[PDB]
Amino acid sequence: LTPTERKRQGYIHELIVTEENYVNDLQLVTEIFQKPLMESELLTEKEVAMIFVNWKELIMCNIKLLKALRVRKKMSGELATTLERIEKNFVITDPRLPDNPIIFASDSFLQLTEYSREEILGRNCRFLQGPETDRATVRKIRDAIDNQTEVTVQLINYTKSGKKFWNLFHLQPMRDQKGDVQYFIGVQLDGTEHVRDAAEREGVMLIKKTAENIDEAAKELKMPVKMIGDILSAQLPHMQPYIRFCSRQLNGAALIQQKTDEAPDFKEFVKRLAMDPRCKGMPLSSFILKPMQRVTRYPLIIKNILENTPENHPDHSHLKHALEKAEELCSQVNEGVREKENSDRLEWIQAHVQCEGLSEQLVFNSVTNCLGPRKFLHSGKLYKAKSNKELYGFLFNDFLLLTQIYKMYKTPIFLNEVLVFHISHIDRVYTLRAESINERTAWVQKIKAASELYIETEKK
């Protein structure tokens, strides 16, 4: 096993194992946190929905994924228990995989060759060959594989230790219903000499009949497929509920923290729920991170599976497309957090700011002139020098709105004609006092950044 291919088997293992633990962790929260809190009646139905939100929808979303990953591993388990009734020396190889690796080795083959199944799977059967092995006979086996036809030859093979033995070897393809070759069956009949006449004729019939049983006992069974990207590439586009969860999970964490401080009964109640040994000593709040942590760790896993998957591997075409779809999901979720917060801020402003003395009806949550959707940036208490009027400003990406504790103060100051504490608009010069130096830093840095963004975009 090459170090590269060994890492691949390890990262594919990581994907499924961590998925098992993740789906289980989702179900733990529902069992010992969500359902108890729903009955506790310390939170209203709305308050519970503000915390766990579509947790249930995330579980069904990943179970469908988990079952798909399990079926693939189950194929090798159901097959092994089926081909266990055949106590003969045989291996099964996958031509569609690089260098035609052994995807299955019988128990009898391992006893004869003195090899373990872990030292064999994923390698070409050429390791059985040695010094006295007739290279001319070996090329007869190669041709039959390239020609996709059966063959039966006799050649010297060696064990793990080096014990010599003649091998009455029979090879035959395993075609599907469509007619294409998908697998190869290799039956070994160990001996001590090169069998001839009646001894050979009998042996040839035996191994050929053996291969016929293997082809039938393993037929109509969807064979173990050594790839995992095909599933991920088709399952990840359905991870939409993650966009919804993470966008609203922040309000939920702040809801619990609030309920925790202003109610000592609530804090102790939740802590007792976390005393479940299944929690490994972790609080409820940390479990909320797991859905966000899972999507961000999907590209990390897939990327490592991909970088240990060769170009000529049929999984490379899928893993590459899956990693693209995985990274899209994170971005959509990442932006989903930004969009939900933005809407929450703007809708709050829409029904709290009175717009009088204005020509057009100002809709905050709408489209700007050249920047698209309007974005809230900063807002804080602002005192006007030489007047000391209690003002309050809402900074956006396109303009600055000055209000008063909300009734509008003046005409909405656009940022394509604003300058940078001292803030300058065309001729008019505004002098505004900040509450602190750090807040004066926050305003200046954000106003200048938003102003320059407007200008450069307008200069196109």
């Binding site: 293992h13 990581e14 609080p283 709040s285 966000m292 961000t296 994170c330």
Partner: protein, 176 residues
Amino acid sequence: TIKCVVVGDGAVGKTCLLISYTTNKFPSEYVPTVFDNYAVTVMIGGEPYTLGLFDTAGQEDYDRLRPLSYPQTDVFLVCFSVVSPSSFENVKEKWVPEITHHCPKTPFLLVGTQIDLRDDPSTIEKLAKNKQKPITPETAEKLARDLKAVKYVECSALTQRGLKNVFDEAILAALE
């Protein structure tokens, strides 16, 4: 329970030092895993303390997902590879300003990682080709003062040198 969060650039060794600390062994290349939220209990002066360990790996390039881990954080671990200078620059340019913004009352350590590669001849060769030199502790201790970090620590998840010490000093910083 003390919540400790590990932050820093990608591939600086955040996940490894977490795994190597909790599992007492450096992650094999053939058996690689992620780091779920883990809790360990160490003994300092006869007093048991419980650490809440969080891994922010995979979030570095997502600005709205990163701060989700930040609430209720008791101590941060701002990480940089002593071999990677760009990870050392993002300390004062990104990570320390970011945790100061979200958690201004939360103390943080300056963690230099992968210190076992600082003497490695093969690694210095690659850094020499880009006119770069591995970050000496004297350099990093200067950044620790300038950014008002509690202190500076070095560790190798591979050698386990000063690995235990990092999380020990992390606890002491959260008891201030």
